[PDB]
Design a protein around this ligand. Structure first.
Ligand SMILES: Nc1nc2c(ncn2[C@@H]2O[C@H](COP(=O)(O)OP(=O)(O)OP(=O)(O)O)[C@@H](O)[C@H]2O)c(=O)[nH]1
Ligand SMILES: Nc1nc2c(ncn2[C@@H]2O[C@H](COP(=O)(O)OP(=O)(O)OP(=O)(O)O)[C@@H](O)[C@H]2O)c(=O)[nH]1
Ligand SMILES: Nc1nc2c(ncn2[C@@H]2O[C@H](COP(=O)(O)OP(=O)(O)O)[C@@H](O)[C@H]2O)c(=O)[nH]1
Ligand SMILES: Nc1nc2c(ncn2[C@@H]2O[C@H](COP(=O)(O)OP(=O)(O)O)[C@@H](O)[C@H]2O)c(=O)[nH]1
Ligand SMILES: Nc1nc2c(ncn2[C@@H]2O[C@H](COP(=O)(O)OP(=O)(O)O)[C@@H](O)[C@H]2O)c(=O)[nH]1
Ligand SMILES: Nc1nc2c(ncn2[C@@H]2O[C@H](COP(=O)(O)OP(=O)(O)O)[C@@H](O)[C@H]2O)c(=O)[nH]1
Ligand SMILES: [Mg+2]
Lengths: 270, 287, 234, 273, 296, 254
């Protein structure tokens, strides 16, 4: 007694698989916070090999946004991924307004995609808009450096910002909890709207530890091993789930229906 | 990465929005449009029989809202009334081409708006067009060939022979040939099923060999024991709607059992919503 | 002696006549090309049939009308038929087929009947009767009776057969060129995927009733045409 | 030992003990590198306390160097100790020539000391010139931050600087020694000469860990292990204590008032008119 | 002394272990000045004070005027090296007209000051590889007349106190009696006090050696004997002196307070002597001179 | 009848010796001055008469000593009073029964130095042609025997080079006594009138924590030699003064 409405999701899935997939992930952070190692570990553990050095050599004379188009064949699904990362940021002699190239790249990608998909003769084209930016934070232990506060309060209406506690494996749970409370009190002295997962803030923000060496991929210290697989504060699974497994389509949806649309009603405003 | 769950991430969010579909049934009064469609959705709808004294073709455009295990479809059924029943044929397709044009128009003029919303919109475009053909038995009639002459470039038209219990099979096949040649006489490329996605293309390919279908519909359920199935009753026999030798109601119910519904949306948005824009939208700019 | 075989070119007139009179009136006839029947002209040909019955007439010729319908727009669409009947009625000095694929009397019925019912007595006939259920048959029969009554249309009017004929005026008919077999009754049948329809069954249709009415009231038609319509002619 | 002029060591010992002692140590580095904790752990966790907090608040709007005076009377010998701390250094958005207030402070101390020991009516007024400078280089790994590179090519000819790899508990030994060797390469490539502490495993710079929690009793308990400051195989806090406190204060003062104060005065008094 | 304390012993009481070792590695330098008449025993006093003959043919009584025999030696007992500088007057009191006696001595001392001071105002300072020659101690000999101080002795004592640290010693104590030595000592100390002559007072600040200095303060001036006539009194010792009525010994406290004199070198006050020259004599000369020096 | 002079630096112990010669005290109230005002003190004549007839019959001799001689830092011609005194005495006696007419002059020499301090040479070059000079090493209890003989030889040599006219003694036990007496010059003396115990008993002598120096022992010093020479040659000194010095003064300006 059914006509076949249930088959619509099956058609949607089978159609989307054939068309291929793309992604563009921004990683922003001062050097030495494990960005390259984390990004290499996340995706199949193959990128930034000594054949292609990348920002591991922190060239600080100039900042030059360097993406990397890579192709991954997950069994039968094609993912064309880019990791937009800025070599050299917030570490040189001066760092005032040291974020203009980043917002430059983001707005340029928005504008170029809008050009691609707004002409009369438009067709199917690649997509190069960034979907989410992971902003690393060093574990100072007292609050947030004013550069991070300016980065939040400035570039937050344009791209999904996810604050990470870079190298969380150098903190104590009591001071880590007080650090979390302090940062989410300065988040309400300076009102900031981070990307909130749909529906609790106590076990936020995400803190991550990354590595490449196998030992369980974990780092070795004289007093043993620092691991990545846990749930207390070295949470290398909550990010890999609430970024890839669960909400990544929601990331695209919120970039489009909010961010990309905010720009589209900004450049078309007058 | 081990996370291939990207294709599932958007399936689970569309059902939250709900689905929207549309259907255009074109055929002169009396062929059994409302009856066939009520049987197709196995539901009783609001379409009462019309009158032969309708001076001008009108569009019912009756909307509904059905349900299934998870999906909440918002149907929008549009059917011609008083079509092809007077002495006028070269001016018959106008009120059934202006309809598809005006259904393009609203979505278009909302696509170019400044503070536009697209996550939740009720697309009113016509997504498919069944075409009932009278079961005459020599070749396609005048109005039929003229209508498929200048309609195939707007919707994924599908030719089906209605009231197909008054044509012998030993003759029917010849009719098929004697119509398909006319299809390639004017050379009209009626909807070709994809036959490109190697996962499922051969079903579409064999569907295209029997592309001129045959259908019948009635809201009376007669034979029992097996089940309460719907059929046809005459003092000399009974007609089974899904016997695969009387009528092809199942073969037409392959756009509804959804071998290809999303393909119809894609071809509407990329091969009929484009020729209306790649060429016809050149009024302003880029010349 | 006047009759017509007028239909929408596909109701089944050819096989109906060929099985009614056991003829092959068109040994070499081809259906007009589909791409060629845009401006489908209407043309009339001749006939040559000898009738064998209890009474034998000199000869019988039917007014074959290829291309009467299938018109993008009937400009004239009525000229050659009335011309031929007027000429046939001047030398001295009628079946109308309703399609079953409709709610009742489609347009072109009121015009044609209103035009010719004062010229020759008309015999309504529903072609392709094997697609109408009995409830729908009665519904459409009542509807057409009301329609002919509403706009003042007069058609026609032991005695048990007379009452039966006068109680079902719009005869339901089929035509069957080739004899096919069914349940031991094999006389001019048509094959369907659910078996065979038999033309001469009194319950499926009223073909033999039409044949008896025509073959017995030929004198009636001749006299009404020679006394009533002849006075109105001049 | 019959004529007995060999009793000079005893005499100078007694006079020094009776006179008293003083010292002044300065710490610089990016705020949040664990400096106040290390200072407390050095002189047994009594200088900075919730009664008087140091650079933990880190008011970085204006980097005004602060100094704290403590009196310690451990073994019958009482010195007055001056901890010199920099609130706001390097943390803010701009780190352009941020070292200037430190230079101002040290050179003003030199000038006031010179005014002390140049008047006719000179006396035994306390000396304040900073004797030791501890720099906390962040343990970023594979490279030296340019800010500190330009820091230690300017002040190294004014005060004894001993570079310290702060929070060195976060470096695997292989990367630790590779980073140290690269620091030597960028030192002996940019012509940098630093205090030589008059080896192989204890190759300068030195690594320090500063803890205040009483567990394991200065130590830190991470949810994966323990970090202890006394053991020498994990870190090298005791090495810094040996060649900073117990052994080389006198040499530090000698080099300060023999090679640095001497150069400051051979600059000034050779440029005076 | 309510202060902020520590907990564990930081490794703290090791400053007067770094300062001590720094000075040993660079040796010490000392300067003694022997002031007294010719023939009193100055050269023999130093010979029996440092247990080694140094030099010295006795000054002729035909010396036209007092000069200064200055001599720097490199003695070393153990682990300690002294640049010693003995500065003995020659001809002091030889001639008759002794009114112009002390000047050739006193100027000498002042001259030595300049050396040290000449390296201070000089900008190419090297004060760590430097060997000053300032007179550090002044041992002043007094002839045992028995009545009072001789006139030249009084005048030199009064007009040389405020330059270098003086210790007055009674030379040749083989002449006066202890029955009369007490009255001699009382009279000479009384006229020292009456004439405002402020002898070196041993320090009474520190409490480790407070009362040893306190008691040695009341024994001034000392009576001393010095010789090298190698006489063995029954056991190993030579520093004695023969006489037809009985030998005299030097290292006994009954006869002469020789050890009470050596308690300015052997243990207690000689680093303090260096510091005191550096802090109350040198500074006084700086006060009196940096008013013609045109420097503030 | 007789008169004797003693001269020397103040503090050498000459009052005590001249007391020990005559077993008497003859300076009742004398206050030894303080160092503060003897800076530039002068020299006077202290002549005291005392009666002794130990060897002769009646010799109420007077002893003359000069307090404050050479004590001042600069001798402001300290030879004036003594030479004036001797000349005055010769002119007074030769006015002629003898009043004083000083016959012998002891000169005490400090033993601390290395020999004749140039003032001693000055005095013995100024006076040696007027009176009988007798050199006597005062405080002879501070000289070791070897330094004693070296000092004796250097005194003799500084006599020879400056040609000092020391009074040689005029030439069977008498011969041996004169030989030893003329060999032992200059003499050594120790004076002490504090009667202090010794080996025999109750003798004159000084006391030190190391010894008890006596006086009449001719081995400790030559005190008894000096006394016996003076007593025996009283007459010879008178004769030499009469026949070589007074005659010379009469031959010279009168
Ligand atoms: N033989 C046959 N009769 C049918 C069939 N479907 C419907 N009918 C009959 O034809 C009549 C007309 O059909 P409707 O349901 O009114 O639909 P329609 O013919 O398109 O007419 P409108 O929908 O009012 O324009 C119905 O009442 C049925 O009794 C069919 O498939 N075969
Ligand atoms: N009374 C006394 N005589 C001494 C003493 N020491 C040495 N003498 C003797 O006195 C003489 C003086 O010797 P020196 O000490 O060399 O003479 P001086 O003091 O150096 O005199 P100058 O050469 O001018 O410096 C020596 O020959 C010794 O024999 C002493 O302590 N007391
Ligand atoms: N800070 C840090 N350095 C690492 C880590 N793993 C390896 N390294 C060292 O850092 C060098 C490469 O640095 P890089 O990965 O570019 O540092 P990043 O930019 O912070 O990711 C290698 O030579 C390693 O020795 C890590 O997890 N953190
Ligand atoms: N349902 C039905 N079909 C028929 C009948 N007679 C003929 N046909 C079919 O109708 C088709 C065309 O008939 P045709 O000769 O063109 O009829 P005409 O147009 O009226 O002359 C033939 O192929 C026959 O199979 C009938 O009685 N009933
Ligand atoms: N891992 C590690 N953390 C440290 C160390 N020293 C201090 N900390 C952390 O640094 C925090 C205190 O920082 P603080 O010294 O006040 O920073 P400052 O005020 O800028 O000098 C504490 O919460 C400690 O957890 C160390 O040696 N290793
Ligand atoms: N060693 C020694 N000391 C003497 C001798 N005679 C006197 N004295 C000391 O000299 C002091 C008195 O000397 P004095 O006769 O007044 O000499 P004057 O002052 O020159 O007249 C006494 O205190 C004695 O200690 C002597 O023979 N030997
Ligand atoms: Mg000498």
């Amino acid at each position: 007694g059914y006509v076949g409405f249930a088959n619509l999701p099956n058609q949607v899935y089978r159609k989307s698989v054939k068309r291929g997939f793309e992604f563009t992930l921004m990683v922003v952070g001062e050097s030495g916070l494990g960005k390259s190692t984390l990004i290499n570990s996340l995706f199949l553990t193959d990128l930034y090999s000594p054949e292609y050095p990348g920002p591991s050599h922190r060239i600080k004379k100039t900042v030059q946004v360097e993406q990397s188009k890579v192709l991954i064949k997950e069994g039968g699904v094609q993912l064309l991924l880019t990791i937009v990362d800025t070599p050299g940021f917030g570490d040189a002699v001066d760092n005032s307004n040291c974020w203009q190239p980043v917002i430059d790249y983001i707005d340029s990608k928005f504008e170029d995609y809008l050009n691609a998909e707004s002409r009369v003769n438009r067709r199917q084209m690649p997509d190069n808009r960034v979907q989410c930016c992971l902003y690393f934070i060093a574990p100072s232990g007292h609050g947030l450096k004013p550069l991070d506060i300016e980065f939040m309060k400035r570039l937050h209406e344009k791209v999904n910002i996810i604050p990470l506690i870079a190298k969380a494996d150098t903190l104590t749970p009591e001071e880590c909890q007080q650090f979390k409370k302090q940062i989410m009190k300065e988040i309400q002295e300076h009102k900031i709207k981070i990307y909130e997962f749909p529906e609790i803030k106590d076990r936020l923000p995400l803190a991550v530890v990354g590595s490449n060496t196998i030992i369980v991929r974990g780092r070795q210290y004289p007093w043993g091993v620092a691991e990545v697989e846990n749930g207390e504060h070295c949470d290398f699974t909550i990010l890999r789930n609430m970024l890839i497994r669960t909400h990544m389509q929601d990331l695209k949806d919120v970039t489009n229906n909010v961010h990309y649309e905010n720009y589209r009603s900004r450049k078309l405003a007058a | 990465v081990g996370f291939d769950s990207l294709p599932d991430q958007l399936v689970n969010k569309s059902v939250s929005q709900g689905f929207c579909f549309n259907i255009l049934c074109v055929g002169e009064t009396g062929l059994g449009k409302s009856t066939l469609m009520d049987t197709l959705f196995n539901t009783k709808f609001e379409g009462e029989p019309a009158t032969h004294t309708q001076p001008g073709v009108q569009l019912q455009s009756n909307t509904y809202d059905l349900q299934e295990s998870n999906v909440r479809l918002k149907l929008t059924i549009v059917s011609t009334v008083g079509f092809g029943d007077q002495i006028n044929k070269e001016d018959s397709y106008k009120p059934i081409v202006e309809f598809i044009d005006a259904q393009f128009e609203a979505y278009l003029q909302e696509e170019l708006k400044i503070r536009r919303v697209l996550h939740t919109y009720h697309d009113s475009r016509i997504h498919v067009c069944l075409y009932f053909i009278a079961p005459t038995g020599h070749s396609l009639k005048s109005l039929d060939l003229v209508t498929m002459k200048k309609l195939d470039s707007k919707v994924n038209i599908i030719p089906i022979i209605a009231k197909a219990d008054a044509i012998s099979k030993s003759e029917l096949t010849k009719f098929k040939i004697k119509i398909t040649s006319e299809l390639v006489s004017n050379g009209v490329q009626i909807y070709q099923f994809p036959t490109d996605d190697e996962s499922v293309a051969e079903i579409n390919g064999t569907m295209n060999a029997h592309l001129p279908f045959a259908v019948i519909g009635s809201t009376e359920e007669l034979k029992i024991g097996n089940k309460m199935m719907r059929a046809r009753q005459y003092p000399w026999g009974t007609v089974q709607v899904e016997n695969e030798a009387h009528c092809d109601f199942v073969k037409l119910r392959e756009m509804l059992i959804r071998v290809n519904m999303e393909d119809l949306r894609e071809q509407t948005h990329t091969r009929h919503y484009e020729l209306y824009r790649r060429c016809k939208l050149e009024e302003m700019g880029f010349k | 002696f006047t009759l017509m075989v007028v239909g929408e070119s596909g109701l089944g007139k050819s096989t109906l006549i060929n099985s009614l009179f056991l003829t092959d009136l068109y040994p070499e006839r081809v259906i007009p090309g589909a791409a060629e029947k845009i401006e489908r002209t209407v043309q009339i040909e001749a006939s040559t049939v000898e009738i064998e019955e209890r009474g034998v007439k000199l000869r019988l010729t039917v007014v074959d009308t290829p291309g009467y319908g299938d018109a993008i727009n009937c400009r004239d669409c009525f000229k050659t038929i009335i011309s031929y009947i007027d000429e046939q009625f001047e030398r001295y000095l009628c079946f109308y087929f309703i399609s079953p694929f409709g709610h009742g009397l489609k347009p072109l019925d009121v015009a044609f009947m209103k035009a010719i019912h004062n010229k020759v007595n008309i015999v309504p006939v529903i072609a392709k009767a094997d697609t109408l259920t009995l409830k729908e048959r009665e519904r459409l029969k009542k509807r057409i009776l009301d329609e002919i009554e509403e706009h003042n249309i007069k058609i026609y009017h032991f005695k048990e057969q007379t009452r039966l004929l006068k109680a079902s005026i719009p005869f339901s008919v089929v035509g069957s060129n080739q004899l096919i077999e069914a349940k031991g009754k094999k006389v001019r049948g048509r094959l369907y995927p659910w078996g065979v329809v038999e033309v001469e069954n009194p319950e499926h249709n009223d073909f033999l009733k039409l044949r008896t009415m025509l073959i017995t009231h030929m004198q009636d038609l001749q006299e009404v045409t020679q006394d009533l319509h002849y006075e109105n002619f001049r």
